[PDB]
Amino acid sequence: GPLGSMPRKEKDFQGMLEYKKEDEQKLVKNLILELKPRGVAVNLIPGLPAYILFMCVRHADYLNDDQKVRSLLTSTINSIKKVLKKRGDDFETVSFWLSNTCRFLHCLKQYSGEEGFMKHNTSRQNEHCLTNFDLAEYRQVLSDLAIQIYQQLVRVLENILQPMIVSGMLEHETIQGVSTYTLDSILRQLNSFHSVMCQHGMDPELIKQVVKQMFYIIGAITLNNLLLRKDMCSWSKGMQIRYNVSQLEEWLRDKNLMNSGAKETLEPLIQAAQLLQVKKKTDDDAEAICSMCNALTTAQIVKVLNLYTPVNEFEERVSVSFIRTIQMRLRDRKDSPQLLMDAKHIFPVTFPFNPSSLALETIQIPASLGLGFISRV
């Protein structure tokens, strides 16, 4: 039936989107620069802007149009940087663009046509692979861009967290008979950060990295305050920290994040709290401290013992002899000289490939996005 029949059947959409060269700057403006992150569509389908962008890349490749391909990827990358500069003080917008930049990168891989990335693809998804261009070079650029966005997300979340840490982990006291933010404030805030990331469809492997980084920041700020303040080094602070850490650990358990590396970053703080609790008088007490505090430096152990504030009914001041016993024993240990931890340290981030089951041929364009000048192919 190669000739025409009536009625004429509507075409079967292939999951591509065409646009006119003259409309490129409008396209990125509407889909990136002035896109509302709280829009219904882009939250019902997390990563929608990235998918739409990819579908557009797809049509340009289909037409074997190298010039349109180059121009679109360059506009897409520059616009993402643009919106990150203007709006990057806000956690929501940075989480949103980190997630869409990752999804865009994942799409470039999943539909590259390279066999190594096609492994979880359906037959249909494989029909959607690029056929004319190798975009490996652009992927590296997007990954570097994603590294920069992550570092900004960490700066944003640190600025929200930092004022809560000391107050929440150290200063709130309820213990009786033994001598503003709470632990709940911190737990709620971690919950909020994590809920937003999940709702944005951020990679679970990336979310795990963000969580490890947030727990590192908690532990480092808290421990640095113990090492600078006499009033924070006491048996009862030790008990309160021990409990606060247990709740943070239970947050990890509840969210199934026990593999994020988050817990392990608390180990110095944990051992400091334990040190505040143990006996500090005899040679045996000293040996036990040295073998217990394997994750603290000699400088940190010694500092805690010097600052230690005794409650006389229960204990005494730590003696100069005892500290000298600790120092002699720790001579055989080859430790780091650090006293304070670097609370600004950022673990290097990775973006392991996370293919999607979304079927591009089922995507439709909502009017709200202001993209009527685009058409489906």
Author numbering: 1461 to 1639, 1658 to 1855
Give sentences from the paper.
Type V myosin (MyoV) motors move protein complexes, organelles, vesicles, and mRNAs along actin cables. The C-terminal globular domain (GD) defines this class of myosins and mediates the majority of cargo interactions. In vertebrate Myo5a, the GD also mediates autoinhibition of ATPase activity in its cargo-free state. In this study, we describe the high-resolution X-ray structures of the GDs from human Myo5a and Myo5b as well as low-resolution SAXS-surface envelopes for all three human MyoV paralogs.
